[PDB]
Amino acid sequence: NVPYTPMRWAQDVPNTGVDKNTRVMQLIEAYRSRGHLIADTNPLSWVQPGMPVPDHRDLDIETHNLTIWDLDRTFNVGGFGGKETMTLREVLSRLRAAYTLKVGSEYTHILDRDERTWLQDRLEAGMPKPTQAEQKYILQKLNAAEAFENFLQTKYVGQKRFSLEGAEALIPLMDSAIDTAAGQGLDEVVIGMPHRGRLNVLFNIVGKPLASIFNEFEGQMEQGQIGGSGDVKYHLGSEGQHLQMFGDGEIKVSLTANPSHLEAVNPVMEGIVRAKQDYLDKGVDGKTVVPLLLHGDAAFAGLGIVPETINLAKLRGYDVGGTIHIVVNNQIGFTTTPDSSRSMHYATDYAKAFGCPVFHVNGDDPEAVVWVGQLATEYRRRFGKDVFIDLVCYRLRGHNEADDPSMTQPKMYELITGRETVRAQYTEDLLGRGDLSNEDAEAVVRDFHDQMESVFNEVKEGGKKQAEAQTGITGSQKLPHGLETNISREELLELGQAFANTPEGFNYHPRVAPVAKKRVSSVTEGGIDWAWGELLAFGSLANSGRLVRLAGEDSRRGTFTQRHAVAIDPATAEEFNPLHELAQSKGNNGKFLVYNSALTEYAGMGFEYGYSVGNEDSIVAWEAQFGDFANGAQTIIDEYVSSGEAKWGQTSKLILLLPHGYEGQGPDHSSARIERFLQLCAEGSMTVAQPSTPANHFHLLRRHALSDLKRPLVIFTPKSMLRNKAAASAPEDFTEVTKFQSVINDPNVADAAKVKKVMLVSGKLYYELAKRKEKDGRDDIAIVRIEMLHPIPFNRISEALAGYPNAEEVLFVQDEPANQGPWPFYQEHLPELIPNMPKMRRVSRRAQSSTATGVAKVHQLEEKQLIDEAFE
């Protein structure tokens, strides 16, 4: 059992052609670059049958024209090993000790010279010898891990727990990293992980009490929100403190909630870290909250969310100072082996796309694992980049504790069954080298087992409660009754002037300058458009002292060239942000931050959800280029935004801005899928709206921000109505009207006793129906708008309908096909809530498999047909 190729027999060769010093330098370079291919990093003596084996002929002395006859000759090595001269025997010895034992390293692909040199120097010095106290501490942590698993196995046999047996070195690795961070003087560590070994990390790293975990197994579950539904035990989070064992440091440790969908926590935990860093406010030399992210081997190589999130690492609105990644490589999926899971040689090969170092370590050598953890945390602090650790280990049982792995992997489980554990091997090694006594080794085991037995008995004394029905979360938060959302006239004029107070030698672009002038004059003469209404809302909130963040694709300029929140000078390329300047000059330390995202919907929306959870007092909004591209983030909508409160008691106030409207641009530029969002709504989970005037958009945003109702808000924004002059607003609507309106009654009814038809509408189709009513002189019709879709404002609709006492019909008019839009939701729910209402009649487009037509002339024909049908 020796891992190297034997020395071969050959004749001595002449020193002609390429000199032999050149050949020894090429050998040094080959080991530094490719020595990881023959390193002792696998605990099993296992080669997977269907995977390609890379060529490693570069690592034998025959390929470089050297021979056994050169081993005692002396060569120039140019500073290698801190020496100018050396023998080939000593060169080989040093290379093999540094690159071929229990740690394999990849770092030669890095482009910067100072980075490479730092790693090379530390990797060739070697691992320093640890003290006896340190060694005993590693043994205590290994014992805790294994003991906890065995206890649960014995007391709860059938129950599913996802054990860590085979990979117990994870606990001392995570402990090493957190300890190093506490020594550097940082503030917090945030963890995200999957199912494998979660209950073990909660108890041994985060500090969740043991009574809580035993209660969970007996069927008593802690309640997050009053009337909530809950979730399984390996999807929950917690908080705690960590004290340095040999130091005076202290750090805070947190773990975040997640669903079963793998790798969906990656963008969410990045956002939590960014929000916490922004609140501390320590600058460019700060970045004092550390992200620690755990993965599995199959998931890391397979799912596309992983590289999509790593791509945000060095961008302006997303940087968090680097991420420490740990991949638990146990050489198997569920029933699938690596040959069917990836086309890369290693699972951690995405690192080479981003220019980052990788460390592969054997999971049966605990002292090497502790060294790699320390070295990774130091690299992050100095260079501010991502680092990857690959922990090679195995899985002792099946995927869960009810599965038999021998059915599909017979030969692999011949090597696994009946091994000795990592705790047993380490105890034997220390007793051999005289580093520990037997009394000590026996106390370590006895003490921990007594502790667990004590707690267990205490938990069984208390009787078990019986099951009870879950009530719901509708009334668990209060509604803001009697809140006024209008600003003063002085405040409005100041916001207007912000766009005239340019810096010293700044000029606008000729096509942007008219927009600025109109903003300054409109706050006194009238004609405020949609974009200006939105910015007035965010600006007012930033003045009062809040952090406002807006992110999305092309969101600084706007997709439809409507926003202009940051302007650029054509001559010098200088930037200007008016509303941020005004906010910083009022002495409440408010901020208005606008960012252009990368081209992603899954990672984008996930990052903003995380930001809202990490800072409860910020106002965050994510914008989509068109609302039709939000189905690329369906996982986030279904697993976090729509259902997080009912499952975990985690609340958010994220704002989604989704453009919507039927205008003839085709099936992928027409609908944001209102019907889908209204399906997800129940128990008052979130608010859904489609306003028709800039002032009403202003009031909706301000009510959300100033209330104490911590639930999300989904708005359906316009595309063509942005520049419609019948939709503009007057200044009195921002300063004398006090509240948001959910139903707007018809403003052009001469006499209410002559009405015989009522039309209900939502959105931009109002302005067409109104136009036609004026042209044809119809005094028997009244058009009523619905601005808030969920919840249903049934008291207001009832009040409006009651105002027309001679009505015989009610029509519901929409632009969308009959199986889309708000009609399905309203035809089900509204008749129950208003019993005395006449039967409703739909007027819409026919039902379709796609969203809309692809021909423009057909679109125009359909619209004419629709409006004609509405007016008999």
Ligand X SMILES: Cc1ncc(C[n+]2csc(CCOP(=O)(O)OP(=O)(O)O)c2C)c(N)n1
Ligand Y SMILES: CC(=O)SCCNC(=O)CCNC(=O)[C@H](O)C(C)(C)COP(=O)(O)OP(=O)(O)OC[C@H]1O[C@@H](n2cnc3c(N)ncnc32)[C@H](O)[C@@H]1OP(=O)(O)O
**Binding-site residues for 2-oxoglutarate:** 235, 260, 669
Quick one: 113 or 775, whose CB is closer to a second copy? 113
Nearest to 198 by CA among 241, 256, 242: 256
Residues of the shown chain interacting with Mg ion in the complex, contacts defined by CB under 5 A = 296-297, 330
Quick one: 669 or 764, whose CB is closer to a second copy? 669
- Pairing of the two strands 575-576 and 547-552: unpaired
Q: Residues within the annotated binding site for acetyl-CoA?
A: 687, 703, 739, 742, 796
Q: Is the dihedral of CA 595, 600, 606, 607 positive or negative?
A: negative
Report the alpha-carbon distance of residue 567 to residue 574 in Å, rounded.
Answer: 8
**352 contributes a contact to a second copy by CB under 8 A:** yes
**685 contributes a contact to a second copy by CB under 8 A:** yes
480 touches, from ligand Y, ligand X, a second copy, none (C-beta below 5 to 8 Å by class): ligand Y
**710 contributes a contact to ligand Y by CB under 6 A:** no
Backbone angles phi, psi at 285, to 5 degrees: -90, 10
Nearest to 733 by CA among 482, 480, 489: 489
**Given 568, 680, 709, 867, the residue binding ligand Y (CB under 6 A):** 709
**Given 647, 703, 757, 796, the residue binding a second copy (CB under 8 A):** 647
Q: Lay out the site mask for ligand Y across 722-761 (x = CB under 6 A, - = otherwise).
A: -----------------x--x-------------------
**794 contributes a contact to ligand Y by CB under 6 A:** yes
Q: Lay out the site mask for a second copy across 93-132 (x = CB under 8 A, - = otherwise).
A: ----------------x-xxx-------------------
Collapse the DSSP code of 227 into the 3-class scheme (helix H, G, I; strand E, B; otherwise coil) and give the result.
coil
Residue 301 CB, nearest approach to ligand X (Å): 9
Quick one: 327 or 689, whose CB is closer to ligand X? 327
Question: In this chain, which residue has its C-beta nearest to ligand X?
Answer: 296
**342 contributes a contact to a second copy by CB under 8 A:** yes
CB atoms within 10 A of CB 284: 8
**400 contributes a contact to a second copy by CB under 8 A:** no
Residue 657 CB, nearest approach to ligand Y (Å): 17
Query: Which residues inside 662-691 make contact with ligand Y, applying CB under 6 A?
Result: 684, 687
Quick one: 394 or 812, whose CB is closer to Mg ion? 394
What DSSP string describes 713-724? EEEEE-SSGGG-
Yes or no: say if 196 and 168 are a contact pair by the CB < 8 Å rule: no
Nearest to 192 by CA among 319, 323, 73, 364: 323
Q: Residues within the annotated binding site?
A: 196, 235, 260, 262, 297-299, 330, 332, 669, 687, 703, 739, 742, 796
What DSSP string describes 755-767? --EEEEE-STTHH
Yes or no: say if 248 and 492 are a contact pair by the CB < 8 Å rule: no
What DSSP string describes 680-732? H--SS--EEE--SSHHHHHHHHHHHHHSS----EEEEE-SSGGG-TTS-B-TH
Yes or no: say if 580 and 547 are a contact pair by the CB < 8 Å rule: no
Report the alpha-carbon distance of residue 541 to residue 590 in Å, rounded.
Answer: 8
CA distances 432 to 131, 141, 435, 445, 503, Å, are 16, 20, 8, 19, 75
Residue 799 CB, nearest approach to ligand Y (Å): 8
Report the alpha-carbon distance of residue 146 to residue 165 in Å, rounded.
Answer: 7
703 touches, from ligand Y, a second copy, Mg ion, none (C-beta below 5 to 8 Å by class): ligand Y
Secondary-structure breakdown of the chain: helix, strand, coil percentages, each rounded to the nearest 5: 40, 15, 45
Residue 194 CB, nearest approach to ligand X (Å): 6
End-to-end Cα spacing for the chain: 92
- Give the residues across from 713 on adjacent strands: 655, 687
Query: Which part of the chain contacts a second copy (CB under 8 A), choosing from 565-573, 750-758, 761-769, 777-785?
Result: 565-573
Residue 84: is it exposed, middle or buried by C-beta count within 10 angstroms (0-12/13-18/19+)? exposed
355 touches, from a second copy, ligand Y, ligand X, none (C-beta below 5 to 8 Å by class): a second copy
330 touches, from a second copy, Mg ion, ligand Y, none (C-beta below 5 to 8 Å by class): Mg ion
96 touches, from Mg ion, ligand X, a second copy, none (C-beta below 5 to 8 Å by class): none
44 touches, from Mg ion, a second copy, ligand X, none (C-beta below 5 to 8 Å by class): none
Quick one: 194 or 627, whose CB is closer to Mg ion? 194
**573 contributes a contact to a second copy by CB under 8 A:** yes
Yes or no: say if 464 and 219 are a contact pair by the CB < 8 Å rule: yes
Nearest to 690 by CA among 711, 707, 675: 675
Yes or no: say if 225 and 193 are a contact pair by the CB < 8 Å rule: no
**822 contributes a contact to ligand Y by CB under 6 A:** no
Q: Residues within the annotated binding site for Mg(2+)?
A: 297, 330, 332
Residue 484 CB, nearest approach to ligand Y (Å): 9
**CB-hemisphere CA count at 13 Å for 832?**
6
Instruction: Provide the residue type at 517 as one letter.
Output: K
Residues of the shown chain interacting with ligand X in the complex, contacts defined by CB under 6 A = 196, 260-262, 296-299, 330, 333-334, 399, 553, 599, 625, 629, 632
**646 contributes a contact to a second copy by CB under 8 A:** yes
**503 contributes a contact to a second copy by CB under 8 A:** no
Tokens of 198: 């979660």
Residue 735: is it exposed, middle or buried by C-beta count within 10 angstroms (0-12/13-18/19+)? middle
Query: Which residues inside 213-272 make contact with a second copy, applying CB under 8 A?
Result: 219, 221, 229-232, 235, 259-262
**Given 354, 456, 576, 767, the residue binding a second copy (CB under 8 A):** 354
Report the alpha-carbon distance of residue 380 to residue 290 in Å, rounded.
Answer: 9
Residue 381: is it exposed, middle or buried by C-beta count within 10 angstroms (0-12/13-18/19+)? middle
Question: How many residues at the interface with ligand Y, by CB under 6 A?
Answer: 19
791 touches, from ligand X, a second copy, ligand Y, none (C-beta below 5 to 8 Å by class): ligand Y
**Given 32, 395, 423, 711, the residue binding ligand Y (CB under 6 A):** 711
**323 contributes a contact to ligand Y by CB under 6 A:** no
Report the alpha-carbon distance of residue 262 to residue 327 in Å, rounded.
Answer: 13
Q: Lay out the site mask for a second copy across 308-337 (x = CB under 8 A, - = otherwise).
A: x-xxxxxxx----------------xxxx-
Report the alpha-carbon distance of residue 305 to residue 807 in Å, rounded.
Answer: 55
**791 contributes a contact to ligand Y by CB under 6 A:** yes
Collapse the DSSP code of 404 into the 3-class scheme (helix H, G, I; strand E, B; otherwise coil) and give the result.
coil
Report the alpha-carbon distance of residue 493 to residue 522 in Å, rounded.
Answer: 10
Tokens of 132: 């006896």
Q: Lay out the site mask for ligand Y across 467-506 (x = CB under 6 A, - = otherwise).
A: -------x----xxxx------------------------
Quick one: 482 or 805, whose CB is closer to ligand Y? 482
Residue 260 CB, nearest approach to ligand X (Å): 5
Binding site for ligand Y (CB under 6 A): 474, 479-482, 684, 687, 703, 707, 709, 711, 739, 742, 791-796
